Design a protein around this ligand. Structure first.
Ligand SMILES: O=C(c1ccc(Cl)cc1)c1c(-c2ccc(O)cc2)sc2ccccc12
Ligand SMILES: O=C(c1ccc(Cl)cc1)c1c(-c2ccc(O)cc2)sc2ccccc12
Lengths: 154, 152
């Protein structure tokens, strides 16, 4: 049993590494790292609800959009965490690139990210991304509200 | 042996931290090293708000019990890692928010916590969430990214 779990964790780690280092035109094939019904997307949004892309095929189609709106995106400072579940990994990293959203000025986006990767049979079943949307607001020229700090300890 | 022993003890401390509620929050700083750091890494400013030192952490807990008087963490999932001294926690949290100068409200959010250990106690705790939900709980307007040109 431990041999099978050990093997799964070593294999899944290699897929996480591959995912995190995928840049440029290779992003068009990142969806092959997922199960046929795998889900990926952004769990921290302006609205409160995740924006998730469901299915390997739709993930490949979303990649076409991503190469237009995040044309040169890179993940940096990658730290991969194995867990007691051989099929569950977390990643702490940063990310950076141009942001080219419709109807907004071209900007430069930088942020800190946490990723969750859950695996089934050697491929990604669920990827979720967590960040602070305030930095994406700033990259688009959108005003970020401020919590008044006068009454807080300081 | 040395790594295994550390991880089992450290997991107990993470569990204790995440289940500390009510007046026991006033003693939660005793789970940290003398120079331990805790705080919020996802803010409105872009910089962390970190509380530095076990003594300042205990002082901050007094403020926290006033402003989050009934706070609980829920849906707690603790992740050990290949570092026996590094743990991650996925959870939710909820309770009243009583912030200076804002209407009393109810705050609910999803959280990730990072716990790094030194010699049996927490050296660094970091909390990550979506500040837009805290804005909502305070009655602060959340900006909206225009979707019109985005796939839907
Ligand atoms: O970057 C993103 C985003 C969301 C989900 C994914 Cl999978 C990737 C980027 C965001 C939006 C988006 C929605 C639909 C769409 O097809 C493309 C982008 S809307 C919004 C709002 C706030 C923060 C981030 C985003
Ligand atoms: O809840 C918090 C917060 C920040 C740090 C900790 Cl340790 C706990 C709560 C926030 C602020 C705060 C700053 C100083 C202070 O002594 C008390 C609160 S300012 C702000 C801004 C946006 C989101 C959350 C917070």
């Amino acid at each position: 049993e431990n041999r099978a779990q050990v093997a799964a964790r070593q294999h899944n780690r290699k897929i996480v590494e591959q995912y995190m280092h995928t840049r440029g035109e290779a992003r068009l094939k990142r969806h092959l790292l997922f199960t046929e019904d795998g889900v990926g997307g952004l769990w921290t949004t302006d609205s409160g609800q995740p924006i998730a892309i469901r299915g390997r095929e739709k993930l490949g189609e979303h990649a076409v959009w991503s190469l237009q709106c995040f044309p040169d995106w890179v993940w940096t400072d990658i730290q991969i965490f194995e867990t007691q579940d051989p099929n569950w990994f977390w990643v702490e990293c940063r990310g950076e690139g141009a942001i080219v959203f419709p109807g907004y000025p071209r900007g430069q986006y930088r942020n800190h990210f946490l990723h969750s990767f859950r695996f089934e049979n050697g491929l990604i079943k669920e990827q979720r991304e967590f960040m602070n949307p305030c930095e994406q607001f700033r990259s688009l020229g959108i005003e970020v509200p401020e919590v008044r700090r006068d009454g807080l300890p300081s």
